[PDB]
Scaffold this active site. Structure first.
Site, mmCIF file in Angstrom:
data_model
loop_
_atom_site.group_PDB
_atom_site.id
_atom_site.type_symbol
_atom_site.label_atom_id
_atom_site.label_comp_id
_atom_site.label_asym_id
_atom_site.label_seq_id
_atom_site.Cartn_x
_atom_site.Cartn_y
_atom_site.Cartn_z
ATOM 1 N N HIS A 124 0.657 -1.101 -0.016
ATOM 2 C CA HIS A 124 0.133 0.023 -0.351
ATOM 3 C C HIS A 124 0.873 1.530 0.237
ATOM 4 O O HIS A 124 1.051 2.512 -0.847
ATOM 5 C CB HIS A 124 -1.130 -0.130 1.038
ATOM 6 N N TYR A 128 0.855 4.581 -3.023
ATOM 7 C CA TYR A 128 1.733 5.859 -3.246
ATOM 8 C C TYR A 128 2.894 6.570 -3.698
ATOM 9 O O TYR A 128 2.487 7.692 -4.823
ATOM 10 C CB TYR A 128 1.358 7.152 -2.084
ATOM 11 N N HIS A 218 -8.012 -7.193 6.886
ATOM 12 C CA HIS A 218 -7.410 -6.667 8.417
ATOM 13 C C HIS A 218 -8.142 -6.021 9.465
ATOM 14 O O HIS A 218 -7.802 -6.789 10.336
ATOM 15 C CB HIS A 218 -5.862 -5.439 8.115
#
Ligand SMILES: [Ca+2]
Ligand SMILES: [Ca+2]
Lengths: 318, 313
Positions: A124, A128, A218
């Site tokens: 993740h 970005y 999660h």
């Protein structure tokens, strides 16, 4: 009359490697047994998270350049800052938070599931960076990192969960591990969805949805394991933990409100992003077995935003 | 800055793990994947993520025909050997690789070790996937019982754990290279011996996917070991070299005893030991040291090396 007359005994005679270390280097160590899974939920979650593996190369972010170039420098700065702040929270969770859950696991399979979580949160964060590589100048990237380290409302959120991960209360650490994917990044995810509802950066929102597909699991799994432990505790201890969950959530909500007001102050987005954040605070509570106290007005999300949030994340394969 | 230094924020901040280590002090920075302090980290991140795989991709059910040509004794040997490898992978996934995260030199290295831990978990899960297809429940359970009760196996499993838990990061890093770099090769010899004889080809495809990861884990831990050791005083570099050789020879002794017990009824130990010591030489070289082992100590038969690099039976 009649004739008067236990599988996997080795398991009770042995310890996982973590438990061996926890006991002061004592005990016979057992290998994980993926053929006899103590909790089927662990196998289900392992299968889901591994089958959901992705990398940012799956998304053609360069197709966002046309719409990116229609944004003012101030909007581009806002996006770079917002995303670098999300990258900070992912960095915390990948290197501290999810790792910290490994030794607090109920099962051997859960121990390695949390290594997947940590790695995927690292993906993740890396995503970005892929977006920035495609869209942003080196100056925009560096200024956003400077802003991240120097913005106290952001730092206070980054600081908030770390003591629970490093201190010796596994239940509070587990609550923190659910609160990170379940709550703390949604005020930032509001921004790409706001943009893509208006036709800006549509491919970036596909990355966000791949991230969310992981974060949802999660949050769900940490909440499942929280409940599994808490359900065995005394009524007093269960009530104490509920109070802790609400206390910590409300403290995070207050920090989030202050941060989003500052982050979005020139753009008018904070009030809407706060409602979007609090909607997710309610879902977080539900994943830990509690009722949401938030009103419809406190959690209202406009239809075009809710469409972006809710759309499914699904020839390039992994 | 006089010289217009870029990314000065980096020197003014700390990673999250450092913020924890310093007693909750400092401004925390996000990882910066646009400014990679050591380009080797980006190379390694890219290779390990491109190399992602899962065992279900390999149709192990196509090994059933050749598994059935193996005697119960050979099947037991395979299940035991692989369950012993699963134990070492369980150690590395849940203790060893995660212990490297807080000893990293760069932010990118911190998350590379999370990939390593997860991928080693996939290695361990792969043996179970093989067993699900090939083995009976009794074979699986008996191998687990044998693992917990075989002292020569346990002594190897116990050897490296204190370094991961104690507070010397360089000794922990040596262990992190030794695990993928040495300890499992004595076991990997067996599927390659069988595949050189036309047995279990699909299982050997899984073994090759595991090896493709292990080679990088050993290389990278050895690379980071050398990065830190090169900054030490000559006397501290000498102390560290002595530690590396002492620990390696200790593990070699534990491994030789284990392999002799494991393969005793099959006549594989001397070849498997040379296979193991060959990779011991490659472990030392990945840490910057010369291998002291002879060609005869490291002899791999050409049939085995071809499996590596892809009348008696
Ligand atoms: Ca507004
Ligand atoms: Ca022999």
């Amino acid at each position: 009359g009649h004739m008067a007359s236990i599988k996997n005994q080795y398991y009770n005679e042995s310890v996982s490697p973590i438990e061996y270390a926890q006991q002061g280097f004592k005990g016979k160590m057992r290998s994980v047994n993926w053929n006899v899974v103590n909790d089927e939920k662990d196998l289900e979650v392992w299968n889901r998270i591994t089958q959901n593996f992705w990398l940012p190369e799956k998304i053609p972010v360069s197709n966002d350049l046309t719409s990116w170039r229609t944004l003012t420098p101030e909007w581009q700065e806002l996006i770079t800052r917002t995303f670098t702040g999300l990258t900070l929270l992912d960095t915390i969770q990948a290197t501290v938070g999810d790792v910290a859950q490994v030794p607090n696991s109920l099962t051997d399979h859960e121990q390695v599931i949390y290594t997947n979580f940590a790695f995927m949160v690292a993906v993740h964060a890396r995503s970005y960076g892929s977006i920035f590589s495609t869209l942003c100048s080196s100056e925009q990237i560096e200024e956003a990192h400077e802003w991240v380290i120097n913005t106290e409302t952001l730092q206070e959120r980054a600081k908030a969960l770390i003591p629970y991960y490093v201190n010796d209360d596994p239940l509070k650490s587990k609550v923190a591990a659910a609160l990170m994917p379940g709550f703390l990044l949604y005020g930032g995810f509001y921004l790409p969805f706001y943009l893509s509802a208006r036709g800006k950066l549509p491919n970036t929102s596909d990355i966000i949805r791949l991230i969310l597909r992981d974060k949802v699991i999660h949050n769900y799994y940490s909440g499942y394991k929280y409940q599994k432990k808490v359900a065995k505790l005394s009524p007093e201890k269960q009530a104490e933990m509920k109070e802790f969950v609400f206390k910590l959530l409300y403290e995070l909500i207050d920090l989030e409100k202050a941060y989003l007001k500052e982050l979005y102050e020139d753009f008018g987005l904070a009030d809407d992003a706060i409602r979007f954040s609090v909607y997710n605070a309610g879902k977080f509570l539900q994943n830990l077995g509690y009722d949401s106290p938030f009103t419809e007005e406190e959690t209202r999300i406009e239809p075009e935003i809710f469409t972006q949030l809710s759309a499914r994340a699904d020839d390039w394969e992994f």
